[PDB]
């Protein structure tokens, strides 16, 4: 008998990525971009988008020839074969989801409390543990149910943020928008663009779902490209409104719910509540997509060296212990570091993943096509942004610097241990057609 997976259309895939991207940038890390970038935030989103499109150049070329739910791990194995590098990168991919869950946990709390509450290390942890555990339990009753609502939640929050843009363009303060020129603000804008690389993390949910996407050779590259452009214009369109309606120092003060307060001067409490409600569900749908679509896929891949040919995406479909591990280390990253920390580690983990993808594109450039000049250029740009991020933490928050360095080593060390015990190998079964199908 023939089994077949439920396949996603182009726009369902686009919506999925747009959802996680908006939930991670607009409603989560916006406060960290207020402090570091200031009035130069619209430029930060443009600059981060440029980095993303250079990475997209590699992803779209590779994703048009190499189809796999393994995502970037297929590209890497097609390039440098099976080894501890490839294996550590697959665990790193799983980690990218783990740390993102922490990022969403903090963002949720940042809009939950100022809606219903004090703000402290204990109250934050309570709101964080409570929302993660709810999604951990959602596997057993309603992860599929929320997953069916994801497409609607995205359309609504786009209308919510869509009114936020055009209604804000009547009450703008053009004097607060005009870009800063001072060196410390310019370098601050550049430093923020490094932490805001994660703002375009749609690469993960699309490629890890590529075999569950209709006409994947066509619709995966398209989804990645369309999805970046939508959020880039949304980011900028929102960033201008927020800064040109509230003093930036008040936004740094009210960091955790930056957009909630920024609506009050021009929409009232009807707008405040709308942005607060719109934020919670935005993050909710982003978490559901990250855990049930991303983390579950990346975990089984790192654990087994391959993925099942047939599985339900919107539940933890295999190795349930991984669900709790993903949820646990998701809290362990939200407990230690603050929003700046989590965001900094997230971008660092993503960049190393992207660096090896651009390298894979270069190794396989004869097979997949593209210009060598652009690939080499993309590699250097991403490498520089990565170093800038590491240099920033080295001097600003050295605890986060060691938090980043330990992760890459810890992931590398665990891979050595895992490959010794289990002997797990990665095979081309990730991307080679199953013969029966």
């Amino acid at each position, epitope marked *: *008998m023939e*089994l077949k997976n439920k396949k996603l259309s182009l726009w369902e895939a686009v919506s999925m990525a747009v959802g996680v991207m908006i939930g991670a940038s607009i409603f989560s890390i916006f406060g960290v971009g207020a402090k570091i970038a200031g009035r130069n935030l619209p430029e930060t989103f443009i600059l981060s988008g440029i980095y993303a499109l250079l990475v997209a150049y590699s992803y779209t070329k590779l994703g048009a020839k190499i189809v796999s739910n393994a995502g970037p791990i297929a590209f890497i194995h097609k390039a440098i074969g099976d080894n501890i590098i490839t294996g550590a990168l697959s665990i790193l991919l799983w980690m990218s989801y783990v740390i993102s869950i922490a990022l969403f946990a903090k963002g949720f709390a940042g809009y939950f409390l100022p809606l219903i509450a004090p703000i402290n290390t204990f109250n934050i942890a309570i709101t964080e543990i409570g929302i993660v555990a709810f999604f951990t339990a959602l596997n057993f009753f309603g992860s599929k149910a929320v997953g069916r609502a994801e497409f609607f939640i995205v359309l609504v929050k786009l209308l919510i943020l869509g009114l936020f843009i055009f209604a804000g363009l009547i009450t703008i303060h053009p004097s607060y928008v005009i870009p800063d020129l001072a060196p410390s603000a310019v370098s601050g804008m550049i430093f923020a663009s490094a932490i805001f690389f994660l703002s375009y993390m749609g690469f993960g949910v699309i490629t890890n779902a590529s075999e569950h996407i209709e006409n994947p050779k066509k619709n995966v590259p398209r989804a990645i490209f369309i999805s970046i452009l939508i959020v880039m214009f949304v980011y900028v369109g929102v960033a201008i409104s927020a800064i040109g309606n509230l003093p930036i120092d008040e936004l740094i003060k009210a960091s955790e719910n930056a957009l909630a307060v920024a609506a009050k001067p021009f929409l009232g409490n009807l707008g405040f509540l709308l942005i607060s409600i719109g934020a919670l569900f935005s993050i909710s749908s982003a978490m559901n997509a990250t855990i049930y679509g991303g983390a579950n896929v990346a975990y089984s891949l790192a654990k087994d060296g391959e993925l*099942p040919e*047939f*599985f*339900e995406r919107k*539940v933890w*479909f295999k190795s349930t212990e991984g669900l709790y591990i993903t949820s646990a280390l998701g809290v362990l990253f939200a407990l230690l570091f603050n929003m700046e920390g989590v965001a900094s580690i997230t971008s660092a983990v993503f960049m190393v993943i992207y660096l090896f993808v651009i390298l894979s594109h270069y190794i396989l450039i004869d097979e997949v096509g593209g210009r060598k000049e652009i690939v080499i250029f993309s590699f250097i740009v991403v490498l520089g942004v990565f170093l800038l991020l590491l240099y920033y933490q080295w001097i600003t928050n050295r605890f986060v610097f060691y938090g980043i360095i330990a992760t890459f080593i810890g992931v590398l060390i665990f891979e050595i241990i895992y490959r010794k015990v289990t002997k797990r190998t990665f095979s081309n079964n990730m991307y080679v057609k*199953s013969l*029966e199908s």
Partner: antibody
Amino acid sequence: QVQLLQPGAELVKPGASVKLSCKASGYTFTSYWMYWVKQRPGQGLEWIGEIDPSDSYTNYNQNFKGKATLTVDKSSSTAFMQLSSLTSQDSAVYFCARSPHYYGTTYNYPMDYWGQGTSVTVSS
Amino acid sequence: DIVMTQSPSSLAMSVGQKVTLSCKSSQSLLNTSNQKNYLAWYQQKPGQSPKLLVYFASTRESGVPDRFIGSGSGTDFTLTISSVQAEDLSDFFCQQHYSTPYTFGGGTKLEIKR
């Protein structure tokens, strides 16, 4: 195209053991269950147990707990069934059979592709 | 364990004739959320492996003649052979694919009259 290779016959002495082999081809071995089925002459079919070839998870029919042990080898796409301390009762035809998995769902599936079965004969 | 019961024991039919084989289970094979019945039908020709005919109560396996029709739900199931052919001579086994341990019925033998 999809097939499971089983040796035709095995002769074994009472008290000894056999490792019956089931070689898969035409499909991704670790994406489907492997079931095993016992048929004695003039009798119906009895499901011995199951193995997930990806992580070696097993589940046995209570009647064969301690009698049969299921293992796989992933590289060779081969499923094995070991039968312990063989008696006259164990002489029969043993089938391996594929079964669709579909992870994270409530669907269980019957057996779509079967081996030709190994007729095991327990004799001195 | 789920007990599977088949009826009748054996039947002798000439070519073109219609027969209805029945299969009964001690427990419902209907998944309340799925709305699917986890019952399969097989054909075993003498000296051969069982061949899957029907699964989920009513879906014919690829390549199986239209003459075989499965129906029923809950505990009572049917395999209709609308026009038995010379080749159909065999044992027909039902199997619940609902719950482990998976269990088969004892079978119905079909022999051909001529």
